[PDB]
């Protein structure tokens, strides 16, 4: 028998509002969920480089500065794990839901207006929130030195909850599993996503393995 607390939080208006906008709009292109997600890697991976350079002890919780993505057909999932800087609970509470930046309202109103097209979002300071074009779920597992690795979930209606993690030790680093929606699963093929990531990572210095998972 186990035990977990779980905490639950509301998002902040307008990050509801753009969540639904994101899940209840047709778009024809969602690849910029993959350029997002490893966007967000590489720049958790330059932070705690960064912070390397000014203090070398912080890199003994894994040594590793490396992005691993992994399609698995058979969960319906597609998994993004970086061995960068990683987030406490507080950072995850601020960061991903109850603070909204003047981004929010001005990316819907272009979305709206014609200005600017879902491919934009990373500019308007809310690219995480593109997940949600392919994914039902998403789950945010992260390890920062200065806290316990905790889990971030959420199915958007307004709501996620965050609990200390009980799975697999990341040692530092985020892993985000997106669990996908079903006509979108096309992203877990081997040959889609692989050809994806290098056509997503030209300009990305950190070394990338791509891990399919095959069931049996
Ligand atoms: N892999 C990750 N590692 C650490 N922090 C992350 C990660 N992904 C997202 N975040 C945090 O979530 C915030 C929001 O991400 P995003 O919505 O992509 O905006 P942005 O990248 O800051 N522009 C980031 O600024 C980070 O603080
Ligand atoms: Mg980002």
Excluded: C
Excluded at 93 to 100: C, D, E, Q, S, W
Excluded at 148 to 159: F, L
Excluded at 163 to 191: F, N
């Amino acid at each position: 028998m186990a035990e977990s607390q779980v905490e639950r939080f509301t998002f902040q208006a307008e990050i509801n509002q753009l969540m639904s906008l994101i899940i209840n709009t047709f778009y024809s292109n969602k690849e910029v969920f993959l350029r997002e997600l490893i966007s967000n890697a590489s720049d958790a991976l330059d932070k705690i480089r960064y912070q390397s350079l000014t203090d070398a002890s912080v890199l003994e919780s894994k040594t590793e500065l490396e992005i691993k993505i992994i399609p698995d057909k058979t969960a319906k999932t597609l998994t993004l794990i970086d061995s960068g800087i990683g987030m406490t609970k507080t950072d995850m509470v601020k960061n991903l839901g109850t603070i909204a930046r003047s981004g929010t309202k001005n990316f819907m109103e272009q979305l709206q207006s014609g200005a600017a097209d879902i491919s934009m979002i990373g500019q308007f300071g809310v690219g995480f929130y593109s997940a949600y074009l392919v994914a039902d779920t998403v789950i945010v597992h992260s390890k920062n030195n200065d806290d316990e690795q905790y889990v971030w979930e959420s199915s958007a209606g307004g709501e996620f909850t965050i609990a200390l993690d009980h799975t697999e030790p990341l040692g530092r680093g985020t892993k985000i599993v997106l669990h996908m929606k079903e006509d979108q699963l096309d992203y877990l093929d081997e040959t889609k996503i692989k050809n994806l990531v290098k056509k997503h990572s030209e300009f990305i210095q950190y070394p990338i393995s791509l891990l399919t998972i095959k069931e049996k």
